[PDB]
C-alpha cells in the first residue's frame, strides 16, 4: 500500500544520503551539490557539471549507479502510479 | 481513449511551463532555453549544455526530476502505443 | 515476428537519417557528427559533445526527442527479446 | 533462477571488457576511465567528461549503445527484483 511506498521512499532517500556523504568527503563537493549530483547521476540525467575526478570515486560511481538505478526507478514507477495518479483522477473529479 | 492521450498532454506541457517559468526567472535563461532545459531534463537526456547555477535552482530540480520523470514518461509511452502504433499500422495497409 | 523486427529497425534507421539530414544541414555538423549525435539523443545518453545552438535547432530537439525516443527504445526493446535473446539461448546449448 | 542473474552478470562484464579494450585501444583511454565511460554510457547516464574524438570511436560507440543498453538494462532489471528485492523483504521480518 502506501507503506510500499512509504518503505521504497526510504530506501531512495538513504541511498541520495550515501551518495551524498561519499562525494561530499571523497569528491570535496558541499553536501548540496554532492545530493544534486547524485539525484542527477541515478535518474540518469547526468548533466556532467559535476562528475567524479580519482579513481576511487569513479569506481564507487560505477557501482552507485547499478545498484541504485533499479532502486530509483522503482520509486519514480510507484510514485507515477500509486500517488500521483490517484491524485490525478481525484483532480479530475467534477463538481 | 484520446482523452487519456489528451490528458497526459495537457499535463506535460503544464509540467514544462512549470519549468520553463522557473528557470527563466530564478536562473536567467530566455524562456526559449528554459524549455528546451526543462525538455532535456525530464526526458533524462541531460545534455549539460545548461544546468542549474544557484542552490534554489538545484533544489528545485531535484524535485523536478522527480515528479516530472513518470509523466513525461507516461506520455511517452501512450504517445508510442496510443498514436504512433495505430498511425503506423494504418500506414502499413497495402491498396 | 521477423518483419515486425524489421519494420521497427526501417522506422528506426529512418528517423536516425531525419536528424542526420536535419543536424547537418541547420546545424552544421558534419553527417557522421549528426548520425552519432541524434543516436545519442534518442537513446537519452546526451554527452553534450554536441547539442544545437540555433533556435531553430533547439524546437526541432525537442520534437525530435518526443517523437523519436518511444521508438527507439520500442526497437531496442525488440532487439533485446526477439533477437538478443533467442541468440543466447541458442548460444547455450550444450553440444 | 540465480543462474539467470550469473548469466546476464557475466554477459554484462564481458559487453563492459568489450568496451573497456575498445575505448582504451583506439581512444587512448586509461582502462579504469574506459571502464567508467563504457558504464556511464550503457546505463545512459552520459556525462561527457569522456566521449569519443575519431570516427571509428563514434561509429563503435553508436552500435555499442544499441547493442549494449538492451542487456545492461535487463541485468539492472534483474538485479532489482532476483536479488535487491528479496534481500529487502528478508531484511524487513522483524525478530
Ligand atoms: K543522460
Ligand atoms: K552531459
Ligand atoms: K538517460
Ligand atoms: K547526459
Given at each position: 500500500?502506501?507503506?510500499?511506498?512509504?518503505?521504497?521512499?526510504?530506501?531512495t532517500?538513504?541511498?541520495?544520503?550515501s551518495?551524498?556523504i561519499?562525494?561530499?568527503?571523497?569528491?570535496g563537493?558541499?553536501?548540496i551539490?554532492?545530493?544534486?549530483?547524485?539525484?542527477?547521476?541515478?535518474?540518469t540525467?547526468?548533466?556532467?557539471?559535476?562528475?567524479?575526478?580519482?579513481?576511487?570515486?569513479?569506481?564507487?560511481?560505477?557501482?552507485?549507479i547499478?545498484?541504485?538505478?533499479?532502486?530509483?526507478?522503482?520509486?519514480?514507477?510507484?510514485?507515477?502510479?500509486?500517488?500521483?495518479?490517484?491524485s490525478?483522477?481525484?483532480?479530475?473529479?467534477?463538481?
Amino acid at each position: 500500500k502506501d507503506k510500499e511506498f512509504q518503505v521504497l521512499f526510504v530506501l531512495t532517500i538513504l541511498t541520495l544520503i550515501s551518495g551524498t556523504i561519499f562525494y561530499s568527503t571523497v569528491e570535496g563537493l558541499r553536501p548540496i551539490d554532492a545530493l544534486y549530483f547524485s539525484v542527477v547521476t541515478l535518474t540518469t540525467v547526468g548533466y556532467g557539471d559535476f562528475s567524479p575526478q580519482t579513481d576511487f570515486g569513479k569506481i564507487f560511481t560505477i557501482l552507485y549507479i547499478f545498484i541504485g538505478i533499479g532502486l530509483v526507478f522503482g520509486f519514480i514507477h510507484k510514485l507515477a502510479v500509486n500517488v500521483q495518479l490517484p491524485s490525478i483522477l481525484s483532480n479530475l473529479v467534477p463538481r
